[PDB]
Amino acid sequence: TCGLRQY
Amino acid sequence: IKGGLFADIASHPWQAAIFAKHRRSPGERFLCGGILISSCWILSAAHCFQERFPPHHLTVILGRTYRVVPGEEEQKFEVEKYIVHKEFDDDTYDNDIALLQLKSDSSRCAQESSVVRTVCLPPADLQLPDWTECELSGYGKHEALSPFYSERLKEAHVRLYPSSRCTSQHLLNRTVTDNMLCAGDTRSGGPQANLHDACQGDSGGPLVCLNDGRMTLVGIISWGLGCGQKDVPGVYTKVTNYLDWIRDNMRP
């Protein structure tokens, strides 16, 4: 969903 | 982005590259950055559209790490209609916000992926503590003095400035209104070569903070005086002030 990314 | 570091699109899936062309279609130039809020809607800065461009002459490219080098999993869309905030002022840049509707074949345009994702809009009551470190990204200049934009995506980190400190006085007498936000690197005497800051070309891009476990959009790179200038913060549009506007103008 929104606000998520890859770290 | 002045200072900062090179970043891969996957670290900021919500960054949009907006390109535009010229008379006779000789080539499409990088206009401004954008922020992906929903599948077919991306926000940007109203000032970027001061030349009144015909929508079909605006291309939003998602999932792209290098400014002009096409990405492995990018998504290019043409603009159907772009709404520019009516109360936007060209002198003061007050109300520097705009919406770009993406043209698609279905109800969905931008297909969420590992490199393409939306930013969570801020809650109406979002009150982030002064000096919280938020981050920004963009393909803009590394130096406001530079004649070139960034060949690749970059990210920087700025500290949110207290309300009081975001005043005309503190910004060389330019008009700072209640729709503006101030953030800027606050380091001195460190090991780094440049103060972190947005710059010409980053406009329309996102200033995002971590809120309730998710990256929340807080402001839109609007304007400033130079880039990475000692004791001068950068101005960003208060997205919270336009949550209402955003919801209202998102018409299919």
Ligand SMILES: N=C(N)c1ccc(C[C@@H]2CCCC[C@@H](Cc3ccc(C(=N)N)cc3)C2=O)cc1
């Ligand atoms: N009086 C005003 N309200 C005013 C003052 C200057 C500008 C310059 C212009 C307007 C268009 C050209 C680029 C732009 C981009 C930019 C973005 C971020 C930063 C930063 N945080 N250092 C610097 C520059 C800018 O600030 C616009 C408006």
